[PDB]
Design a protein around this ligand. Structure first.
Ligand SMILES: *[C@@H]1O[C@H](CO[C@@H]2O[C@@H](C)[C@@H](O)[C@@H](O)[C@@H]2O)[C@@H](O[C@@H]2O[C@H](CO)[C@@H](O)[C@H](O)[C@H]2NC(C)=O)[C@H](O)[C@H]1NC(C)=O
Ligand SMILES: *[C@@H]1O[C@H](CO[C@@H]2O[C@@H](C)[C@@H](O)[C@@H](O)[C@@H]2O)[C@@H](O[C@@H]2O[C@H](CO)[C@@H](O)[C@H](O)[C@H]2NC(C)=O)[C@H](O)[C@H]1NC(C)=O
Ligand SMILES: *[C@@H]1O[C@H](CO)[C@@H](O)[C@H](O)[C@H]1NC(C)=O
Lengths: 218, 217, 111
């Protein structure tokens, strides 16, 4: 099967600047009729993919001027002359010259924004959940940028591992920030044998890591 | 152009089968082929197969050939897609997409100009269970929230003060826990001065289990 | 049209009772395809007679090479006379329908 590889996989770009995505095919994708059915699709957040570029360099109807494609052999490139806000999403290259038809793995285009330090909150386990035998501790990172952030849980200064899941929101359409929720899942047994619970947050917007804590009880 | 509308979400046990439809309108059905495409995080976008409505001819990706059947009813402009012997890894969004048939009267250089809205198929051994809603309160800006825990399947909808409170609300995507159940947190940022003035209530709606919970924080 | 199938002979005449065999040659490029045998009814309405793969008086037979096909009417009748053709339907990669030129079958009276 023809394998389609995209580069890069994450593309943050400032509003108004150019952007470029590379696509490489593991072999030639010339069709037996001589045509090269290389295509570029864009999947805006929460929507279906839509066709951008057909046959290597041809712009589909309704697609703005700033999009353009090019390539030769196994190397193809998608260029955006000026990145606009409505251009965020996942970009896929696609080949239709050989069966099976294959897509690239995707390139997420995000807006590069000025750095924003997160606001950190911590929530203790509730009365009502503790009566259910389980204990959940939530650490919230609100409205930060860039996406890369480290959250480490410490129970009585013991660094936890394996007992925490986390989820991040899509980049906000109005301020271009992310939000993250870390969830320390402990048995109520384990919860009631320790006292202090903290999450340490490392991020480019924080000159030094931030810690939010609470003592079980107080 | 035209339109493609697919059938609703589906949840099935491992080893079962699912059949999803795709209704076309706004264009001539027989002028086009109908493809089926899968999207899952472990898999990316992958092509399943294609049917030509007039002849009933089909072509399948060797990966799915043997456990997928694609059918089309030209009289009702509907294409179908039946996946048998479902595995947990078949959990994905399933799209249908048209492709212009090149003829001596018309030449099509592109593939997928119109797509359906997608159909969610979740394959799991878990059983339908409504969520346990718990408050998230701290021990000049305060944060409050709700922990929506141990529910199946997706989705739930969380609203604050019955839709009145939308500013500063963050509902995070659900994460599949080791128990095969989903967990989700929804938070909101309020001024600290309003902690004793206003009432802040979550509205958790879980249709598959017929569950509505109104939880105040 | 790109890589159409050919349908031969352009004019085939047989005596009523005999078998009539056409040759439709299709050199496929990538084998997700189906071949259909058609007869053109009053003022260009097409009737499907048989299809490869998959009335039993109309037989399609694939020959050893990957190109030639035999389309035979068994015991041709007087009203089998008409216009025939073969169409190739490539499903993937890149959907395309390509027809042959029309051929004529004439069925004459037996003495
Ligand atoms: C006319 O054809 C019939 C049926 O033949 C089929 O189609 C042919 C075009 C060819 O592809 C054959 O291989 C196919 O079988 C013939 O009927 C056969 O008659 C013989 C007589 O002994 C009999 O043994 C066979 O069983 C018959 N065929 C079948 C499928 O049962 C017929 O002989 C042909 N007419 C003449 C005179 O050529
Ligand atoms: C051109 O097509 C032939 C025939 O393919 C068969 O019939 C088609 C209608 C379709 O149903 C195919 O799936 C069938 O295989 C191809 O010949 C076969 O090619 C396959 C390649 O995987 C091979 O395994 C078989 O042994 C071949 N059998 C015969 C009888 O030829 C041929 O490969 C195709 N040519 C090109 C260039 O694609
Ligand atoms: C042709 O004639 C035959 C003779 O019985 C009969 O089937 C019918 O009248 C005609 N059929 C077709 C298909 O033309």
């Amino acid at each position: 099967d023809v394998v389609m590889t995209q580069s890069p996989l994450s593309l943050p770009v400032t509003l108004g600047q150019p952007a470029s995505i590379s696509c490489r095919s593991s072999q030639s994708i010339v069709h037996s009729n001589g045509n090269t059915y290389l295509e570029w699709y864009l999947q805006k957040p929460g929507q279906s993919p839509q066709l951008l570029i057909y046959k290597v360099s041809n712009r589909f109807s309704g697609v703005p001027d700033r999009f353009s494609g090019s390539g030769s052999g196994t190397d193809f490139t998608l260029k955006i002359s000026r990145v606009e806000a409505e251009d965020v999403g996942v970009y896929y290259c696609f080949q239709g010259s050989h069966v099976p038809l294959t897509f690239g793995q995707g390139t997420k285009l995000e807006i590069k924004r000025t750095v924003a330090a997160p606001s950190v909150f911590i929530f203790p386990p509730s009365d009502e959940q503790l009566k259910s035998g389980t204990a959940s501790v939530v650490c919230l990172l609100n409205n930060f940028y860039p996406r890369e952030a480290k959250v480490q849980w410490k129970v009585d200064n013991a660094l936890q591992s394996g007992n925490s899941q986390e989820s991040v929101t899509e980049q906000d359409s109005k301020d271009s920030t992310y939000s993250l929720s870390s969830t320390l899942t402990l048995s109520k047994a384990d919860y009631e044998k320790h006292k202090v619970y903290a999450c340490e947050v490392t991020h480019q917007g924080l000159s030094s890591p931030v810690t939010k804590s609470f003592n079980r009880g107080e | 152009q035209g339109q493609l509308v697919q059938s609703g979400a589906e949840v099935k046990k491992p080893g079962a089968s699912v059949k999803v439809s795709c209704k076309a309108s706004g264009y001539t059905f027989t002028d086009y082929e109908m493809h089926w495409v899968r999207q899952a995080p472990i898999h990316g976008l992958e092509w399943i197969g294609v049917i030509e409505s007039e002849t009933g001819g089909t072509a399948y990706n060797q990966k799915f050939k043997g456990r997928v059947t694609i059918t089309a009813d030209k009289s009702t402009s509907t294409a179908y897609m039946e996946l048998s012997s479902l595995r947990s890894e078949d959990t994905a969004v399933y799209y249908c997409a048209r492709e212009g048939i090149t003829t001596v009267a018309t030449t099509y250089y592109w593939y997928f100009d119109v797509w359906g809205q997608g159909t969610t198929v979740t394959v799991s051994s878990a059983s339908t269970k409504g969520p346990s809603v718990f408050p998230l309160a701290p021990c000049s800006t305060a944060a409050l929230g709700c922990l929506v825990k141990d529910y199946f399947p997706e989705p739930v909808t969380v609203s604050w003060n019955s839709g009145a409170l939308t500013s500063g609300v963050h509902t995070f995507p659900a994460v599949l826990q080791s128990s095969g159940l989903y967990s989700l947190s929804s938070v909101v940022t309020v001024p600290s001065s309003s902690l004793g003035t206003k009432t802040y209530t979550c509205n958790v709606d879980h249709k598959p289990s017929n569950t509505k919970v109104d939880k105040r924080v | 049209p790109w890589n159409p199938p050919t349908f031969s002979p352009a004019l085939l005449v047989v005596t009523e009772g005999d078998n009539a065999t056409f040759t439709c040659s299709f050199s496929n490029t990538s084998e997700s395809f189906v071949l259909n045998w058609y007869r053109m009814s009053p003022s260009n309405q097409t009737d499907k007679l048989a299809a490869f793969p998959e009335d039993c008086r109309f037989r399609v037979t694939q020959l050893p090479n990957g190109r030639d096909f035999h389309m035979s009417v068994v015991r041709a009748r007087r009203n089998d006379s008409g216009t025939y053709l073969c169409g190739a339907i490539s499903l993937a990669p890149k959907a395309q329908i390509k027809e042959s030129l029309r051929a004529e079958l004439r069925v004459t009276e037996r003495r």
